[PDB]
Amino acid sequence: SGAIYVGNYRVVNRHLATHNDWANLVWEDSSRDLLVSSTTAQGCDTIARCDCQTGVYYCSSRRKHYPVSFSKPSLIFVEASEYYPARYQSHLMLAVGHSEPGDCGGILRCQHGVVGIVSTGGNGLVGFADVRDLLWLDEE
Numbered sequence: 514s515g516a517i518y519v520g521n522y523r524v525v526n527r528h529l530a531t532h533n534d535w536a537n538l539v540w541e542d543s544s545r546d547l548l549v550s551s552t553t554a555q556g557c558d559t560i561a562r563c564d565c566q567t568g569v570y571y572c573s574s575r576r577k578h579y580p581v582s583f584s585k586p587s588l589i590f591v592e593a594s595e596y597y598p599a600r601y602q603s604h605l606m607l608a609v610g611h612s613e614p615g616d617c618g619g620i621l622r623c624q625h626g627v628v629g630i631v632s633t634g635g636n637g638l639v640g641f642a643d644v645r646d647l648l649w650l651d652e653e
């Protein structure tokens with residue numbers, strides 16, 4: 514579990530969105546595994562605006578933050594899971610690291626801020642849904 518809290522927005526994995534998230538929907542994209550809902554209180558997280566390929570991610574199944582190198586956001590084939598059939602997921606970055614289904618929502622960050630959240634995994638790889646291209650998260 515986990516979310517990004519920026520301005521009056523809550524960014525979560527679309528497959529973990531609650532009824533309250535859907536009832537207060539701002540934007541959602543199934544191909545990116547992202548859903549954004551509105552909040553009453555303002556958030557503390559800052560979004561990175563860069564093309565970094567190194568950062569640190571939070572792994573709840575180890576209670577640890579790990580430094581990783583990750584690929585640029587791309588269209589990648591993801592194996593079938595409890596939440597999606599086997600399909601191509603867009604704006605996805607991969608790194609070598611541990612992850613389990615429940616690690617979804619853990620933040621990946623760099624020197625400029627939040628880069629994305631854990632979304633996929635298996636076979637010693639961890640995949641992150643990028644949010645750096647969503648410029649509207651900083652305004653409105």
Ligand SMILES: Cc1cc(CNC(=O)c2cn(C)c3ccccc23)on1
Pocket residue numbers: 594595612613614615616617631632633634635636640
């Ligand atoms: C132990 C162990 C090792 C693994 C292997 N990781 C996985 O299967 C998954 C890791 N993440 C972040 C996912 C998201 C959606 C669906 C599956 C996964 O799972 N349990």
Ligand SMILES: [Zn+2]
Pocket residue numbers: 561562563564565623624625626
């Ligand atoms: Zn950066």
